[PDB]
Design a protein around this ligand. Structure first.
Ligand SMILES: *[C@@H]1O[C@H](CO)[C@@H](O)[C@H](O)[C@H]1NC(C)=O
Ligand SMILES: *[C@@H]1O[C@H](CO)[C@@H](O)[C@H](O)[C@H]1NC(C)=O
Ligand SMILES: *[C@@H]1O[C@H](CO)[C@@H](O)[C@H](O)[C@H]1NC(C)=O
Ligand SMILES: *[C@@H]1O[C@H](CO)[C@@H](O)[C@H](O)[C@H]1NC(C)=O
Ligand SMILES: *[C@@H]1O[C@H](CO)[C@@H](O)[C@H](O)[C@H]1NC(C)=O
Ligand SMILES: *[C@@H]1O[C@H](CO)[C@@H](O)[C@H](O)[C@H]1NC(C)=O
Ligand SMILES: *[C@@H]1O[C@H](CO)[C@@H](O)[C@H](O)[C@H]1NC(C)=O
Ligand SMILES: *[C@@H]1O[C@H](CO)[C@@H](O)[C@H](O)[C@H]1NC(C)=O
Ligand SMILES: *[C@@H]1O[C@H](CO)[C@@H](O)[C@H](O)[C@H]1NC(C)=O
Ligand SMILES: *[C@@H]1O[C@H](CO)[C@@H](O)[C@H](O)[C@H]1NC(C)=O
Ligand SMILES: *[C@@H]1O[C@H](CO)[C@@H](O)[C@H](O)[C@H]1NC(C)=O
Lengths: 420, 353
């Protein structure tokens, strides 16, 4: 008869905001006679003792849904995984609020890890929409990771299939090494200078150091990065004029927690509107009964439409993401984040500021060289392409025609025969 | 090394043989800290799992966990993946829900499972269908995840078929049963084998709809994998006569041999790692107040008791032992088919209808 809400939350002002939101969640959400109590955990350095305290708060209390709201994790793991896996044992989804990786987007490892934040494929879509403004076609892709890199490459190929075009060159290597200068030198001799980076913080710092040692901050270089490349030392090693992205009402913790409690409480009351109300079992002795209303709760949550929120109109898609995300296109002008544009879900509106690039003027970086190096291929046709061996070494004898036209020979590279 | 073994109540396997497995065995023990802790838990729950993690890892640095599950979910093994993501302890998936086949693992995780993947299981099922001369088949797949690789493997098999497999188009079920539009999809199925890839209760509903409409004849066969059928203890209602399941839940097969092969592979890995690096215990000590050498890409070339117990690149055995069971009229599941190293063995030549 008692209902406890699982909340991994420890900051006391957000504890008061959580208690106020729990008090407000039972006021106008119907005349149903259920009550909601809070259950919070404290700080631990590890994640296994955190998971122990969480699961002791979960299984021995017959919880409904879990909210994890710690983006400053004390370790470098950044894992909401154990609480989500604990609830996914009982087929219970967890609405995570911190991570945005594409390894959490897969429905094979994380079966029901839902979230109200979009992954980096939406940032790749914003980059593709910025390609549609200045008519960008040939791009260079550099991805260090492999978990999110396959999803980012699949989304980029999907967007280029929507354009019905092709990419120029993609790069996927092993992080940790420092011999990434030769790959950047091979990427220098391509047909374009548009650089797109999708990596972690240390890999972004490594490729920024490699670009600084090779002087890739000259004219025409397109610098368009996201969130992980403007944090930490990658913010320090970035050149002046690099373009990044900023979350609108994403770093604001209290309004995000209040909107998350509102969405979760509206989902719980929507599940309580219909029949087949089941509770998770205990874990003491001799009852291994599974939770039977898994697909029912999935049909409730995955097909839910919302209209309330301080951040904005939240709506869960087929992957459990955020629709119409407000972004801030930011510029790093002399180690200072300068607001140079904002982003609704359908259109980009720059402000009255100047978009200063590390290349030329405030327009798009002229990094197009697909006409200054053309590999002219031809076949040995008898009337069309006469191929003649040189006299001594690489010279062309200027033959004379009958109409006064000198034979303008070109120094080509001709083979003698085929492979047999 | 110190390896703790925990079991439940699957296949009437007790706990005293886990104590007897340490005494006369393990003669060539190159590590000196080789001890076992045999445990039993009545319920399957993550609370007791994290409790035994924080009580046994602090218990003289146990770097081995064996768990026996009796549920119908592979994500229980994903719980062990959290042991593989923080402490980086290699755990061998032995039997039950801790070793069921999922879609895509991660190379950074040191977790392993015992069994063949869904592509090799589909290869075994198509070898069964080729040996029984059942050419025309169907494919009914729901919106349950892990469906792209299976349908893609069937498409690449039919498009590169030496036999000429007549593949019916994919029957998709986006919603539940309505008997308005799915009835047309059920009436178009006139094949012999009706393939199914979904959950347990959805399979019960589809077989009940097929029984209520007369789609469960002798010509209409039903071949299911281990993910659709599940364990052999719980048998729900509305199952047609002629259900052939492919799984590994065998009653007379020794779980003691499974845990003995697991301990042999882990002690072989520890003995091969002792000759390379000195400090073999290098992991998280205890759950109170916070990798360099792992055993993920090191015990691939393992061989215990002469059997091919080597590891694949995805975290599976190279040649496991597949089980093919049938459903008779006596509401029982009897083992029929087993898989060899390279080819496929068939016990019953004359196939009953
Ligand atoms: C919340 O806690 C109070 C005090 O322990 C208790 O009286 C009340 O029943 C609880 N509400 C429910 C039903 O969860
Ligand atoms: C990079 O290459 C050098 C050889 O030029 C090699 O000695 C070194 O181990 C490599 N690793 C680094 C530092 O990235
Ligand atoms: C790069 O730029 C610096 C500063 O202008 C210059 O000294 C150096 O010769 C250039 N060459 C390299 C190392 O790429
Ligand atoms: C909310 O976030 C913005 C940055 O996006 C910050 O400037 C502002 O101070 C924050 N306000 C609150 C309520 O903390
Ligand atoms: C509740 O569950 C039962 C059994 O699964 C089912 O028959 C019934 O349709 C469900 N109720 C509703 C309204 O979905
Ligand atoms: C973005 O912010 C605007 C207000 O500036 C708001 O109307 C809108 O709901 C937000 N984004 C969405 C969900 O379109
Ligand atoms: C986004 O759209 C809202 C109207 O829905 C508008 O008020 C707001 O100014 C827009 N934001 C941008 C990108 O300027
Ligand atoms: C090219 O090949 C022929 C044999 O096919 C050989 O006799 C000749 O010396 C070679 N040199 C030329 C003309 O390129
Ligand atoms: C329950 O577990 C204990 C060990 O903790 C075991 O001794 C007992 O036999 C089990 N009982 C059953 C049958 O579940
Ligand atoms: C097995 O593979 C490892 C590398 O993972 C290698 O060092 C070792 O020599 C090989 N031989 C055995 C059977 O240990
Ligand atoms: C498979 O091969 C092993 C040797 O690696 C052998 O001991 C075993 O009997 C074989 N099993 C069969 C026949 O499937």
């Amino acid at each position: 008869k008692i209902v406890n809400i699982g909340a991994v939350l420890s900051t006391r002002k957000h504890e008061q905001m959580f208690r106020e939101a729990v008090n407000q969640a039972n006021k106008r959400h119907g005349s149903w006679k259920i009550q909601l109590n809070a259950t919070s955990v404290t700080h631990k350095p590890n994640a296994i003792q955190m998971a122990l305290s969480v699961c002791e708060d979960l299984i021995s209390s017959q919880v409904y849904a879990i909210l994890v709201s710690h983006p400053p994790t004390p370790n470098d793991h950044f894992t909401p995984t154990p609480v989500s896996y604990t609830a996914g044992f009982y087929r219970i989804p967890v609405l995570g609020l911190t991570t945005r990786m594409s390894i959490y987007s897969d429905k094979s490892i994380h079966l029901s890890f839902l979230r109200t934040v979009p992954p980096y494929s939406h940032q790749s879509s914003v980059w593709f929409e910025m390609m549609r403004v200045y008519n960008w076609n040939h791009i260079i892709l550099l991805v260090s990771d492999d978990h999110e890199g396959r999803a980012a490459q699949k989304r980029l190929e999907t967007l280029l299939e929507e354009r019905e075009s092709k990419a120029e060159k993609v790069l996927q290597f092993d992080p940790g090494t420092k011999n990434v200068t030769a790959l950047l030198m091979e990427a220098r001799e391509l047909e374009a200078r548009v650089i797109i980076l999708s990596a972690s913080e240390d890999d972004a710092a490594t490729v920024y150091r490699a670009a600084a040692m090779l002087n890739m901050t000259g004219s025409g270089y397109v610098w368009l990065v996201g969130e992980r490349e403007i944090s930490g030392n990658a913010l320090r090693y970035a050149p002046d004029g690099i373009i990044g992205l900023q979350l609108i009402n994403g770093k604001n913790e209290s309004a995000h927690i209040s909107d998350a409690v509102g969405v979760v409480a509206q989902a719980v009351h929507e599940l309580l509107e219909k029949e087949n109300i089941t509770d998770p079992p205990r874990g003491c002795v001799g009852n291994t009964n599974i939770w039977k209303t898994g697909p029912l709760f999935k049909r409730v949550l995955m097909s839910s439409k919302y209209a309330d929120g301080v951040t904005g109109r939240v709506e869960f898609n087929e992957d459990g993401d955020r629709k119409f995300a407000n972004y801030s296109i930011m510029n790093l002008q002399n180690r200072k984040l300068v607001q140079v544009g904002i982003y609704n879900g359908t259109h980009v509106i720059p402000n009255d500021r100047k978009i200063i690039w590390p290349g030329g003027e405030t327009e798009k970086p002229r990094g197009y060289q697909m006409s200054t190096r053309l590999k002219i291929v031809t076949i040995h046709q008898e009337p069309f392409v006469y191929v003649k061996p040189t006299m001594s070494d690489g010279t062309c004898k200027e033959e004379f025609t009958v109409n006064g036209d000198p034979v303008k020979k070109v120094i080509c590279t001709g083979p003698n025969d085929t492979s047999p | 090394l110190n390896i703790a073994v925990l079991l439940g109540h699957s296949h009437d396997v007790t706990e005293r043989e886990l104590r007897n497995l340490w005494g006369p065995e393990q003669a060539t023990g190159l590590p000196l800290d080789v001890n076992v802790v045999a445990l039993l838990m009545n319920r399957t729950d993550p609370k007791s799992l994290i409790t035994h993690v924080c009580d046994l890892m602090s218990g003289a640095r146990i770097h081995g966990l064996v768990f026996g599950d009796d549920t119908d979910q592979e994500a229980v093994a994903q719980m062990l993946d959290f042991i593989s993501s923080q402490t980086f302890i290699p755990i061998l998936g032995i039997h039950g829900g801790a070793s069921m086949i999922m879609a895509d693992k991660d190379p950074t995780s040191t977790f392993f499972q015992f069994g063949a993947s869904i592509q090799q299981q589909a290869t075994v099922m198509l070898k069964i269908m080729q040996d029984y001369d059942w050419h025309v088949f169907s494919l009914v797949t729901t919106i349950f995840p892990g469906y792209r690789d299976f349908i893609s493997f069937i498409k690449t098999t039919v498009d590169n078929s030496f036999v000429g497999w007549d593949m019916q188009n994919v029957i998709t079920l986006d919603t539940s049963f309505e008997d308005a539009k799915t009835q047309v999809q059920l009436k178009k199925i006139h094949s012999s084998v009706i393939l199914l890839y979904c959950s347990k209760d959805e399979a019960v509903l589809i077989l009940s709809e097929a029984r209520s409409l007369g789609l469960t004849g002798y010509d209409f066969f039903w071949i299911v994998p281990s993910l659709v059928s599940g364990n052999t203890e719980l048998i729900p209602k509305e199952f047609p006569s002629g259900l052939i399941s492919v799984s590994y839940d065998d009653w007379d097969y020794s779980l003691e041999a499974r845990v003995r092969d697991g301990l042999g592979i882990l002690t072989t890995a520890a003995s091969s790692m002792l000759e390379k690096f000195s400090y073999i215990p290098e992991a998280k000590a205890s759950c109170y107040g916070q990798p360099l050498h792992t055993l993920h890409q090191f015990m691939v070339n393992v061989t215990w008791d002469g059997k091919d117990l080597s590891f694949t690149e995805e975290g599976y055995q190279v040649h496991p032992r597949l089980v093919v069971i049938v459903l008779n009229k006596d509401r029982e599941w009897e083992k029929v088919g087993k898989w060899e190293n390279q080819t496929l063995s068939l016990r019953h030549a004359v196939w009953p209808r």
